[PDB]
Design a protein around this nucleic acid. Structure first.
Ligand SMILES: [Ca+2]
Ligand SMILES: [Ca+2]
Length: 214
DNA sequence: TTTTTTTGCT
């Protein structure tokens, strides 16, 4: 009936303060709104062909399942580092240690974006930001993970210039697990390769911010 | 909220 956390309302050219969360995008938002004419094609062609094979209500249910399987997977690791997918990654967890961060936020003070990275930990003695994920079809080459490398280096560059973090990171790791328990493909990205993908991430970033001008 | 997940052949 009464407030428990009291604070008063008063205290004894027009302003237009922008809202930071509006003008500072998220990594996933930068990439999803700067997809290539090829990505849009195969994605639209994949939805039309899947809705035809499962209907509108079914394809909406499909989206729900594969979304939850992932989210539950990510949470499971968040607990472990503190199911069929878990058996698939067991041969990778043996090589991971030195966990410095999990489901933690990164903000780029200068390039002005933000994100939530899955994990920061040592893989075979190499500190990288790690990007877990489930997948139905197999992904044997880093090319099969599409924009995921960009998402990873966006997170790295953000952390390396986020004063909430006392350390830097130079490598990236994409782990693709499978429901049938097949071992997980580890797609590692050494410092040099992350510099390659980083340059391409700046392009997507700059394409996005130009898109937001109009 | 962010993120979860989704991508061909001739
Ligand atoms: Ca995530
Ligand atoms: Ca992930």
């Amino acid at each position: 009936r009464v407030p428990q956390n009291w604070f008063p309302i008063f205290n004894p050219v027009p302003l237009k303060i922008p809202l930071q969360r509006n003008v500072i995008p998220s990594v996933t938002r930068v990439l999803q709104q700067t997809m290539t004419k090829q990505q849009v094609f195969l994605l639209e062609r994949w939805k039309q062909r899947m809705i035809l094979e499962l209907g509108e209500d079914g394809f909406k249910e499909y989206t729900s399942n594969v979304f939850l399987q992932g989210k539950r997977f990510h949470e499971a690791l968040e607990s472990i580092l503190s199911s069929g997918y878990i058996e698939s990654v067991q041969h990778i967890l043996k090589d991971v240690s030195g966990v410095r961060a999990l489901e933690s936020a990164v903000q780029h003070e200068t390039l002005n974006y933000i994100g939530l990275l899955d994990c920061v930990a040592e893989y075979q003695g190499k500190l990288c930001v790690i990007d877990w994920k489930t997948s139905e079809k197999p992904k044997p080459f880093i090319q099969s993970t599409f924009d995921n490398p960009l998402q990873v280096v966006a997170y790295m560059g953000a952390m390396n210039h986020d004063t909430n973090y006392s350390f830097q990171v130079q490598c990236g790791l994409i782990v693709v697990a499978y429901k049938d328990g097949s071992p997980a493909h580890p797609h590692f990205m050494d410092a040099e390769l992350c510099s390659q993908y980083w340059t391409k991430w700046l392009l997507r970033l700059e394409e996005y911010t130009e898109k937001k001008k109009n």
